[PDB]
Amino acid sequence: TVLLEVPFSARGDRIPDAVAELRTREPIRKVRTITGAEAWLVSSYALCTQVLEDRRFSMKETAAAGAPRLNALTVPPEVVNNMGNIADAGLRKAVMKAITPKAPGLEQFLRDTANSLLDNLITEGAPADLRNDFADPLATALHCKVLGIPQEDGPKLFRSLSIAFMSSADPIPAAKINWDRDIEYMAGILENPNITTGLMGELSRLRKDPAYSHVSDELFATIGVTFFGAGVISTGSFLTTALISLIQRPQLRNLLHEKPELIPAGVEELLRINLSFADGLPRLATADIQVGDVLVRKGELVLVLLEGANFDPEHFPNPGSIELDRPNPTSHLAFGRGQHFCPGSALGRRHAQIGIEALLKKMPGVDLAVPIDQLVWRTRFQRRIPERLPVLW
Ligand code: HEM
Ligand SMILES: C#Cc1cc(C[C@@H]2NC(=O)[C@H](Cc3ccc(O)cc3)NC2=O)ccc1O
Question: Residue 209, Cβ neighbours under 10 Å: how many?
């Protein structure tokens, strides 16, 4: 037999039995990625946290020429160090502040947009596609608002994402075409006097501030493209798969409909059980480091399997059950951990909370319109998502 291949399954509605078997018997295990490279797959909560909390397991170094790769780059190699570049430019605080969900009127905008999307689906009649006509447009509209760019520019930027977030063995020519075009768009935004709000409005001001005069225009444009793309793909994909998990749990759906104050705790559990990340998080060892029974050597690739940690019964007893009263509810790894913890975690929570609150009010009887096995799971992609999510109500 050949070496165990990753990823195990593109399905986002069930965890393969193999994960629990590996976690119990071999919580760090050698695997082969789609490029042919070997890697260490880490699948227990304890070892996943160890890797993510030790910066000697480096994100930046995964982009080095000649390294064992999980997948091909879809961005320039320096962009793998995006957050380090933002920090070096003195822009970290400003970027973080721009992407919080607490800007005046943002939550009301999210609620209004979700309600409008849902009203259009109700008018059109069942079946409705909750990914393409709800979750993704809601994510796109949210990120246009947060960036300060026109809502009407959302769809074309969104169209890049089915390629930008591919998990491919080989470089993708279309990724460069779209990247270069989206960079040109964001560079134009920085020069557009109408853009005075949100992240791009703030970056546009800082760009002309003497304390930032040697920050490159390339970096300012890259922040726009990367935060739009990572935010939209991550929130749209998470909400989509969370809606599946909610629909498949009518008792919980009814509880959250009846007691909406429990939605934040429900979203935290939906984050914990979420299978949206299709691959382990990659890191390259910069030293020889003991992880469990394995001495990982300098230059080797490690893959941190988020659902390995998040379904680990030693940390989350009865891991497959959504329980709203856990004592460690935010200790999951859905947003990562350590140096590269998601900078948009609060916005991602609020997007899902508001989307779910709106859906349960407008469509309390929501259910799948097709048997669950009929969902078509996107392959060779950095997220697990159904191509369509047909529902009735
Ligand atoms: C529920 C929605 C989201 C989930 C589940 C999610 C998940 C994650 C995870 C697991 C990481 C860590 C990757 C790693 O360590 O290798 C990450 C990083 C990142 N996230 Fe999020 N996220 C979400 C929402 C957002 C939003 C709304 C934004 C921005 C608007 C965003 C922007 C980013 C960026 C830029 C990084 C890279 C941080 C870095 O390189 O250091 N994410 N996200
Ligand atoms: C979430 C996440 C996430 C983070 C990273 C780490 C890192 N940091 C970054 O900011 C961007 C995100 C990105 C990738 C492709 C695009 O077209 C646009 C943005 N690239 C990076 O390599 C990688 C993949 C992700 O999925």
Answer: 9
Residue 346 contacts residue 81 (beta carbons within 8 Å): no
Atom 7 of ligand 2: nearest residue by CA position? 80
**For this experimental structure, what is the resolution in angstroms?**
1.4
Q: Characterize the bridge pairing of strands 57-58 and 289-291.
A: unpaired
Asked if residues 384 and 377 have their Cβ atoms less than 8 Å apart, the reply is yes
| Residue 132: closest CA among 243, 40, 231, 11 | 243
Bond into 16 cis (ω within 30): no
3-class DSSP state for residue 160?
coil
Domain range annotation of the chain: 1-393
Which of 306, 324, 162 has its CA nearest to residue 246?
324
Identify the three-state secondary structure at position 79. Answer: helix
What b/e sequence results for 93-108 when a residue is b if at least 16 CB atoms lie within 10 Å of its CB, and e otherwise?
A: ebbeebbebebeebee
Any atom of ligand 2 within 6 Å of the Cβ of 382: yes
Distance from C-alpha of 57 to C-alpha of 177, rounded to nearest angstrom? 31
Q: How far apart are CA 196 and CA 193, in angstroms?
A: 7
CA gap 234, 382 in Å, rounded: 10
Burial of 14 (0-12, 13-18, 19+ CB in 10 A): exposed
Q: Which residues contact 181 (CB under 8 A, 6 or more apart)?
A: 160
Instruction: Write down the experimental method used for this entry.
Output: X-ray
Query: What's phi and psi for 169, nearest 5 deg?
Result: -70, -25
The CATH T-level fold of domain 1-393 is Cytochrome p450 (1.10.630)
Q: List the beta bridge partners of residue 42.
A: 28, 304
Q: Which of 275, 335, 384 to mutate to test the pocket of ligand 1 (most atoms within 8 A of CB)?
A: 335
Measure CA 148 to chain center.
Answer: 21
Q: How many CA atoms lie within 13 A of 239 on its CB side?
A: 31
Is residue 328 annotated as involved in ligand binding?
no
Q: Long-range contacts of range 126-129, CB-CB < 8 Å, 24 or more positions apart?
A: 126/369, 126/391, 126/392, 126/393, 127/369, 127/370, 127/390, 127/391, 127/392, 128/390, 128/391, 128/392, 128/393, 129/388, 129/389, 129/390, 129/391
